[PDB]
């Protein structure tokens, strides 16, 4: 199983910095990476970056070097293979040309040469 | 710059074969090729990672191949489903997915 | 006195404007004539086409609608312009002076006469591969030894052909063989070559082995030792 | 185009005919076309012989109407294996834009050569590359064709051979060269390599083993 609920779909205006939040069930949070894809309009879509909700390890493109600011909270355990886990996205110098839809998904495997791979995704969240 | 086929179609029944290439930057030998299902504007799918390997789920239809200068992802015995739009993407162990350019299908 | 030497690409992709060029060494350009010819693989050799002394051309009609050939007097270079190629279009494009010939069987004053024209000196070739398939340098790895003793050069995974391959930079001649490629089912080519040299020069006649690949315009060198 | 065949034996005369016979007047030429190679102007006019070419290579000239066009080779040798291309001219016809069909001409009677074997194991920059080739080199063999066979240890081996087709060297010999690729796993796992080449009747095995 796995979901991966996000945020509300509000708008703001060239110049802000908002936040984009990430809440997973149904699997061990801590075990697979965290990924931040952007589905532009006037371009195709983009990996913004990953992170790893256990060892706090990110990894993000060179074209959100300086600008994007990828944090998660601790999990919180449900049952022995199942945890409750939050990831969020944070935009710097901001504008209008970044409009689009926004999507997190998680890690394929834990281990491997696929590890990071976004394999299971949200439902997205529309912005400017 | 990872370019894909600009557009194909088929019919009930048939085959497709989507092509993903580019330069040494991001292509091919020493990458690996994932290829995502993904409706404009929704949750998207992986269909096949490491060049030909399906995810779980996926129909055995779906099929990979990776040439020494350019991926293919072939869609055999076609259905409803099948029209949405697919990406490509290359990426290694320790770094990003360089996603590609799109096909219409 | 005079010879003639081709160059092309090598590769070029399906629908585009092949191009070759031709440099003529002791004599002059525009006062002979040229002419371009090409053998692909089973066919025999076809003539393209030919240019005069006062540059004047004419085609073959079989490819006349897409053949363009210039000539530059600055020096001694002709060129070759072939555009919408096809996987057919790939062969050994020969560069060769023609000659006319007045063939006399009547009367000159009537016109009872004809010319010809035939191709006297040749270039070598330039090897053209039309495949939408891309470049990649080769790997060379040494073949160590152990009356006499063989050590090799293994050229293997480049396309297209060819690859010149040379020893000691050019000093080693003696006993050198170099063999044809082979095409594996990759779809690349796979070379080997080879020289025979006496037992006692391995301590320590330095081998150097040369392996150039133009279409990716990748040279590399490596010393063979036991 | 297509390819006429001819054999003559090591010695004889050669006498190779025209493609197509001449309607009228003609100025004949001869070119020698060996594949992967230049061609070389044997006759440009009906008996014109460049410079650079012996005697014993002659053609028809055209005195009366109706006599065939063809070029002879006296002595043949092994070297004279080509083809012979014949760009015929007339008054009658157009131009000759086509060169013709291609005699084959291949020379019987020529000494039997056994081949020279050489096999060589993965290389081990190659094995570095978690790679491993097996290389078996045959060459100055005659004639141009022989069969390879690589066995691991004793059990043959079929999958992941590739094998040249035989080349014509300058010597006038042949020269083959087999690709046996392995994981270098399997290159460990076994105890010796062997590359059996038969030629004619007999059949020559180089082995090879990781030590
Ligand atoms: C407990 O559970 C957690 C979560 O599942 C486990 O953590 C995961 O471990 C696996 C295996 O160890 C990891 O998979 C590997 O991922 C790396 C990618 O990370 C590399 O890239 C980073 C960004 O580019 C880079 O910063 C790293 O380099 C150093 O820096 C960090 C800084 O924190 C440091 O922590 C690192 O250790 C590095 O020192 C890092 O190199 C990838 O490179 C691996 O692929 C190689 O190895 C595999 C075989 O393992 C091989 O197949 C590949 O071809 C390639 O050779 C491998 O995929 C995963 O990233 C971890 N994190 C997750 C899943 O979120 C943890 O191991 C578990 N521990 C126990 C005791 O159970
Ligand atoms: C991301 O936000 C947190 C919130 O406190 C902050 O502490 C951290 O420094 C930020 N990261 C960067 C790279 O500035
Ligand atoms: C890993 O195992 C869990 C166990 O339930 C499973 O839910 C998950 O899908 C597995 N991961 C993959 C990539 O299949």
């Known amino acids: 199983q796995g979901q991966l609920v996000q945020s509300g779909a509000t708008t703001t205006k060239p110049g802000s910095s908002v936040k984009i939040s990430c809440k997973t069930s149904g699997y061990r949070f801590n075990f697979y990476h965290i990924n931040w894809i952007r589905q532009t309009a006037g371009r195709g879509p983009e990996w913004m970056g990953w992170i790893s909700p256990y060892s706090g390890d990110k990894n993000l493109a060179p074209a959100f070097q300086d600008r994007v600011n990828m944090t998660t909270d601790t999990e919180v355990p449900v049952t022995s293979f199942t945890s409750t886990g939050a990831a969020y996205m944070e935009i710097r110098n901001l504008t209008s040309d970044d409009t689009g839809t926004y999507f997190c998904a998680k890690g394929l495997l834990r281990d491997g040469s696929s590890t990071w791979l976004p394999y299971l995704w949200g439902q997205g969240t529309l912005l400017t | 710059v990872l370019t894909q086929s600009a557009s194909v179609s088929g019919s009930l029944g048939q085959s497709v074969t989507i092509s993903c290439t580019g330069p040494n930057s991001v292509c091919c030998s020493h990458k690996s090729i994932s290829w995502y299902q993904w409706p404009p504007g929704r949750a998207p799918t992986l269909i096949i990672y490491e060049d030909n390997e399906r995810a779980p789920g996926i129909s055995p239809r779906f099929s990979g191949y990776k040439s020494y200068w350019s991926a293919y992802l072939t869609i055999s015995d076609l259905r409803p489903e099948d029209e949405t739009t697919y990406y490509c993407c290359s990426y290694t162990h320790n770094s990003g997915c360089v996603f590609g350019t799109g096909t219409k299908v | 006195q005079v010879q003639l030497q081709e160059s092309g690409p090598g590769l070029v992709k399906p629908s585009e404007t092949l191009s070759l060029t031709c440099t003529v060494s002791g004599g002059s350009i525009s006062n002979y004539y040229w002419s371009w010819i090409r053998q692909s693989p089973g066919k025999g050799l076809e003539w393209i086409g030919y240019?005069?002394?006062?540059?004047?051309?004419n085609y073959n009609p079989s490819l006349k609608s897409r053949v363009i050939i210039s000539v530059d007097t600055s020096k001694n270079q002709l060129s070759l312009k072939l555009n919408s190629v096809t996987a057919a279009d790939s062969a050994i494009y020969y560069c060769?002076?023609?000659?006319?010939?007045?063939?006399?069987?009547?009367?000159?004053?009537?016109?009872?006469?004809?010319?010809?024209?035939?191709?006297?000196?040749w270039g070598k070739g330039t090897t053209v591969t039309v495949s939408s398939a891309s470049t990649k340098g080769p790997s060379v790895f040494p073949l160590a030894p152990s009356g006499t003793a063989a050590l090799g050069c293994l050229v293997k995974d480049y396309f297209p052909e060819p690859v010149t391959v040379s020893w000691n930079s050019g000093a080693l001649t003696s006993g050198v063989h170099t063999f044809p490629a082979v095409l594996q089912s990759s779809g690349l080519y796979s070379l080997s070559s080879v020289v025979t040299v006496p037992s006692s020069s391995l301590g320590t006649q330095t081998y150097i082995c040369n392996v150039n690949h133009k279409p990716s315009n990748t040279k590399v060198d490596k010393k063979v030792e036991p | 185009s297509y390819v006429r065949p001819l054999s003559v034996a090591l010695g004889e005369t050669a006498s190779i005919s025209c493609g197509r016979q001449a309607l009228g007047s003609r100025a004949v030429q001869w070119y020698q076309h060996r594949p992967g190679q230049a061609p070389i102007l044997l006759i440009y006019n009906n008996q014109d012989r460049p410079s650079g070419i012996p005697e014993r290579f002659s053609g028809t000239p055209d005195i009366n109407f109706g006599t065939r066009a063809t070029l002879t080779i006296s002595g043949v040798e092994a070297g004279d294996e080509a083809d012979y291309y014949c760009h015929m001219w007339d008054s009658r016809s157009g131009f000759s834009w086509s060169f013709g069909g291609a005699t084959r001409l291949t020379v019987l009677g020529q000494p039997k050569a056994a081949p020279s074997v050489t096999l060589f194991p993965p290389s081990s920059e190659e094995l570095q590359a978690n790679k491993a080739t097996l290389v078996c080199l045959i060459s100055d063999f005659y004639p141009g064709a022989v069969t390879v066979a690589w066995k691991a240890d004793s059990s043959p081996v079929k999958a992941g051979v590739e094998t040249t087709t035989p080349s014509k060297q300058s010597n006038n010999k042949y020269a083959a060269s087999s690709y046996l690729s392995l994981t270098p796993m399997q290159w460990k796992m076994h105890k010796s390599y062997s590359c059996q080449v038969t030629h004619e009747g007999s059949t020559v095995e180089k082995t090879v083993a990781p030590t």
């Open positions: 240019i005069s002394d006062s540059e004047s051309t």
């Open positions: 060769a002076r023609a000659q006319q010939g007045k063939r006399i069987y009547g009367m000159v004053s009537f016109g009872e006469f004809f010319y010809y024209y035939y191709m006297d000196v």
